[PDB]
Amino acid sequence: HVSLARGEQSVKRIKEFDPGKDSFSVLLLGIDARQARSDANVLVTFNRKEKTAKMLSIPRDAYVNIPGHGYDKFTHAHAYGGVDLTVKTVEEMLDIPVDYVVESNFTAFEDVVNELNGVKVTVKSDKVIQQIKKDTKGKVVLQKGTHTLDGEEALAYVRTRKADSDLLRGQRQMEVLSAIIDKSKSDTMGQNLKMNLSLKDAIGLFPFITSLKSVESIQLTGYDYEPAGVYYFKLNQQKLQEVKKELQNDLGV
Ligand SMILES: CC(=O)N[C@H]1[C@@H](OP(=O)(O)OP(=O)(O)OC/C=C(/C)CC/C=C(/C)CC/C=C(\C)CC/C=C(\C)CC/C=C(\C)CCC=C(C)C)O[C@H](CO)[C@@H](O)[C@@H]1O
Numbered sequence: 003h004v005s006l007a008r009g010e011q012s013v014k015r016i017k018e019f020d021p022g023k024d025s026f027s028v029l030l031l032g033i034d035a036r037q038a039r040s041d042a043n044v045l046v047t048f049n050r051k052e053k054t055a056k057m058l059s060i061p062r063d064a065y066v067n068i069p070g071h072g073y074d075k076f077t078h079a080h081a082y083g084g085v086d087l088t089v090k091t092v093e094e095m096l097d098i099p100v101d102y103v104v105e106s107n108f109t110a111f112e113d114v115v116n117e118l119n120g121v122k123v124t125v126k127s128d129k130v131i132q133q134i135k136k137d138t139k140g141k142v143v144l145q146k147g148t149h150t151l152d153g154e155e156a157l158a159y160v161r162t163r164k165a166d167s168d169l170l171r172g173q174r175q176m177e178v179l180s181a182i183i184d185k186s187k188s189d190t191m192g193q194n195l196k197m198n199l200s201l202k203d204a205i206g207l208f209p210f211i212t213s214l215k216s217v218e219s220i221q222l223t224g225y226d227y228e229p230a231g232v233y234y235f236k237l238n239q240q241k242l243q244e245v246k247k248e249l250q251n252d253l254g255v
């Protein structure tokens with residue numbers, strides 16, 4: 003439990019936030035704790051009235067303004083100013099409140115998956131199986147079809163990446179995240195999960211999160227921007243404005 007420097011509720015909210023009755027957002031950050039850059043960056047917005055969730059993967063190389071540091075790769079916000087600055091960067095990029103944030107290292111992820119007795123993933127790509135084999139020196143060998151993956155297998159699945167674009171990797175992360183929720187429908191954190199709300203409050207949201215009528219994914223499209231060999235992902239501004247309106251409406255702001 004670690005409070006954000008911004009205060010009791012997001013500065014983006016014009017009205018008083020009621021966590022038990024309002025739609026809300028959660029930012030999930032995956033870190034390699036070998037500050038560190040954020041390699042997994044998933045924002046989930048929950049529509050309380052409609053009992054729906056929308057997942058969004060923020061491209062790690064998205065070309066965005068990092069407050070106090072200028073335009074740069076989104077992933078660097080966590081390196082320059084930790085969770086506080088990542089939250090500020092998201093709130094500026096999408097013009098929405100980030101109500102809750104959860105920061106995880108490899109160990110917390112593996113322990114969560116294993117405590118759930120694995121998570122179900124339908125593997126479909128020989129190329130993905132092959133690249134994971136390469137990543138792990140053959141320690142992780144996935145099979146096509148629907149199988150229950152343990153923590154090590156799931157972790158390798160959400161880490162693998164062919165080249166610059168983390169498009170497919172973000173989709174694998176949202177896939178596994180939703181599988182974790184599915185498996186939970188039926189203490190462990192330790193010092194490896196950091197979140198800006200109490201364990202008690204986190205549990206109070208569990209019934210709502212695990213009884214959603216629908217889960218959907220949305221995308222920030224764009225194109226490669228390589229001004230001097232340094233790779234950025236420039237966001238399509240029309241799609242960005244579309245996503246912003248969609249999440250603003252979901253959050254009732
Ligand atoms: C393996 C690889 O290929 N690496 C590439 C490169 O480095 P990289 O791209 O940074 O990857 P990496 O450093 O190894 O691992 C770091 C990568 C990632 C994606 C970080 C993963 C970290 C995690 C903690 C797991 C992923 C996060 C997910 C699925 C979302 C959040 C998950 C959480 C919070 C865990 C439990 C979930 C909970 C509590 C959800 C409940 C709450 C709600 C639903 C509101 O290195 C070479 C050149 O340098 C390249 O050639 C090479 O391709």
Ligand SMILES: [Cl-]
Nearest residue numbers: 125126127130
């Ligand atoms: Cl696959």
